[PDB]
Design a protein around this ligand. Sequence first.
Ligand SMILES: CCCCCCCCCCCCCCCCCC(=O)O[C@@H](COC(=O)CCCCCCCCCCCCCCC)COP(=O)(O)OCC[N+](C)(C)C
Ligand SMILES: CCCCCCCCCCCCCCCCCC(=O)O[C@@H](COC(=O)CCCCCCCCCCCCCCC)COP(=O)(O)OC[C@H](O)CO
Ligand code: HEM
Ligand code: HEM
Lengths: 28, 28, 57, 57, 68, 69, 244, 244
Amino acid sequence: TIDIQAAAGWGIAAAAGAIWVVQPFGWI
Amino acid sequence: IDIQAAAGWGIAAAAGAIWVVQPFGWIK
Amino acid sequence: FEGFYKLIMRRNSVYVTFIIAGAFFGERAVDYGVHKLWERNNVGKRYEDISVLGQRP
Amino acid sequence: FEGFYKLIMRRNSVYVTFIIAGAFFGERAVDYGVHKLWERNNVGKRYEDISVLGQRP
Amino acid sequence: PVKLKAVVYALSPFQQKIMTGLWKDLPEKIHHKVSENWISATLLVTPVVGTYWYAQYFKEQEKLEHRF
Amino acid sequence: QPVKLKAVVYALSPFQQKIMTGLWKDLPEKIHHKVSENWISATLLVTPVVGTYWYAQYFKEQEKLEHRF
Amino acid sequence: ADEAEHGLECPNYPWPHEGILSSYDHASIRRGHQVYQQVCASCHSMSLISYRDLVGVAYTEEEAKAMAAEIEVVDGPNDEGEMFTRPGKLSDRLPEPYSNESAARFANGGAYPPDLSLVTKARHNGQNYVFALLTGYRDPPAGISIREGLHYNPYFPGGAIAMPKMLNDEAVEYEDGTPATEAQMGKDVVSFLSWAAEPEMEERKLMGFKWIFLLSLALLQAAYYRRLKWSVLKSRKLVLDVVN
Amino acid sequence: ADEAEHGLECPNYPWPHEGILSSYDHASIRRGHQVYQQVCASCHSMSLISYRDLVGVAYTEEEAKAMAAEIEVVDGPNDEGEMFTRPGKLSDRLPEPYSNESAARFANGGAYPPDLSLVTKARHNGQNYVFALLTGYRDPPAGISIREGLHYNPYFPGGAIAMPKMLNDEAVEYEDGTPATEAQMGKDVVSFLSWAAEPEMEERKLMGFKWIFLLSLALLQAAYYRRLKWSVLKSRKLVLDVVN
Ligand SMILES: CCCCCCCCCCCCCCCCCC(=O)O[C@@H](COC(=O)CCCCCCCCCCCCCCC)COP(=O)(O)OCC[N+](C)(C)C
Ligand SMILES: CCCCCCCCCCCCCCCCCC(=O)O[C@@H](COC(=O)CCCCCCCCCCCCCCC)COP(=O)(O)OC[C@H](O)CO
Ligand code: HEM
Ligand code: HEM
């Protein structure tokens, strides 16, 4: 039951990286 | 086999130069 | 630093997210500080400090 | 006859010279024949077959 | 490396005729090509030719029906 | 070709050592060592360049003065 | 419906330059250039062609020189900064009939006469199409009315063309004396346009004959070489113990 | 000859935009632009500068819009095919005093007043050079004569320039009441020219400060990382059999 937690962690990482490259604060 | 070969390969090089560049008119 | 280690460094995904957040926030903070220094060093020289701005006949 | 026919088969430099000479002469001979037959196939249609060639007024 | 046992006899290229084999057994060559390949050929030619001819017929009928 | 070696090596973990303080440890000895070992090398590099530059400026100045009325 | 939209098909004509070993008819090129000068150039430009291109094709150097010297070309600036005119040289391009595209449209009912430098290459079946459209002004089919300012031409898509018919008998005087009939002038001008679009055709054809003959000889040699190298493998007798 | 050929060297002036965190003085840019459009523009082009470039630097958008509207820009051709005139817009480049380089030479005794868009980058020590040249018209040294149509300026190479002295006292009037002495207008016009040559300077310096600071932090981290990885090797104790 650790692969699901790894997937969630890496999904959070991917989201953080997305908001960081494109920085869509003027669109949200 | 060393001097004859050198003469032959020099003749071939000169012929190839006359064939690639064709300065028929530079014989002046 | 072992307490912060047990929250940020136990999993590489959290560590990577922490690095992404540090880049974001630190670059913003440095940008703000550099702009503050720039403004403090160039008092009176800005376009917005032109006395007659808007007053060309 | 036999001198060249023995040099071409026995020394690669002479064979390479023979190849170069054959390329030169064969390409010229085909250029010549191809232009002869082109001239024969287009009689009267050449720039220099124009009757009024030289009198524009 | 595969362990192989075989005997191979070969003749030198300069002791055999090089081109005549192109035109030997020619009826056998044609017969084999036709008999092994006619299904594949049909499966390739039939849909293309049929679709083309049907499209031409459709265009001719449509052109005629719009006239006066 | 591999080499045949006989040696004993003892090593300490990187997390059991100070990492940076060794840069500023016995600094005067480091400067001593760099100057003492390298002064001929430094002379041979610098002296031709500076000498040639100085001579060129001297020549230019004297030539300019000679053409002045 | 769609029949008029595409336009009537153009027939195939035996042009003297069709064929893998056929040159242009250079007398016809010169005649077609005369036709261009006296009829076409009034409203069509040929901006990719210059007077030096005609030398050795339809005129001598002196003939093209005098022809260029008969036109006026904008040059400059001079030393005072002002533009001026001068007689044309060999390197000058053919003169444009209009200053710009808008000025061309205004003088032709809003339709723009296209540049003719590549017209034969710029339409499907270009030579035949241009000949058929030039010689194809005729009365429209029953039930078809052409709005004012246009003229009917079944070869033209839509059928209504903004170009009037200008290939008419005796529209040109030919220096060589051949009767300047409508078909003669159309054929000659299409020959000139074919040359203008494809000035490299003869050298290119002369190269294709020589190189296909040579490369076919090379293909024969290569087949012999492959078969000679592979014969030791193809004739080999292989003996194995297996049966099935 | 010897020294006049290269000219007199310009001094170093303390420009307000000099320094790793120093910006342009934008009011001085506006004053320099009025000096330009009132004195320089009758003979020098600034073909790289548009009216939109001034917006947010020395003028509001409406100010630059009215400025551009004051000038007459050629445009077209229209539907009829003629060139016409229209008011200038924010996207137009600054107007050219002359139609071409030959016209400029004809109007300036054979000399061409160079485009001033990059002049401070197109001369050695550019800002100081331009200021020194503008304020450096004076009498020639004893025994030196200048032909008619030229003016002595020791800063100019050779000492004889086709430009007459133009920064005469009160040659302009300033909107903020700044007294328009020759030195004041010289400094203002050089500020404007320096901004014109390098309009990205302020963004460039801000970027430079930020990223050099960050990269210095990164270098400290890289040194720590390298030494951490190498400490196990550098502190190792090696025992070997050999002595000499
Ligand atoms: C919100 C939580 C914080 C988020 C930021 C996390 C990252 C912070 C960055 C690190 C800051 C601390 C830097 C080290 C402080 C210790 C200074 C020091 O003493 O030097 C160290 C070595 O440390 C260094 O070499 C300095 C490396 C600093 C790396 C540069 C930090 C970058 C800052 C990033 C800030 C974000 C802005 C940038 C955004 C793009 C000595 O090491 P040793 O020789 O092994 O031990 C000596 C023994 N004794 C302890 C007794 C002295
Ligand atoms: C050894 C560390 C790693 C390698 C880094 C090398 C650093 C050593 C120095 C290498 C030589 C630098 C280049 C040598 C010539 C530069 C000087 C020059 O050419 O003049 C220019 C001037 O040169 C400089 O301005 C030097 C700038 C250096 C950057 C200093 C800013 C630091 C910002 C971050 C602070 C970092 C603090 C780190 C703390 C940990 C132009 O002057 P200007 O009058 O035309 O324009 C005025 C304006 O100020 C310039 O844009
Ligand atoms: C014999 C001389 C001429 C030749 C060879 C010629 C050729 C052509 C050709 C090939 C086209 C294009 C047809 C297409 O779109 O596919 C065309 C169009 C046109 N030509 Fe000409 N032309 C000639 C003379 C003229 C003249 C003298 C005029 C003007 C009076 C003229 C006006 C036009 C116009 C206006 C068009 C555009 C027609 C449209 O779009 O409907 N042409 N011409
Ligand atoms: C404040 C107004 C002006 C400024 C800032 C200015 C700027 C400059 C600059 C930087 C140069 C380049 C000198 C060099 O090549 O080193 C120059 C040259 C020149 N300027 Fe201007 N200019 C101004 C006004 C004028 C005016 C009003 C005229 C003509 C009436 C003029 C005519 C010339 C000429 C002819 C040259 C070239 C002189 C030569 O090469 O001998 N300038 N100017």
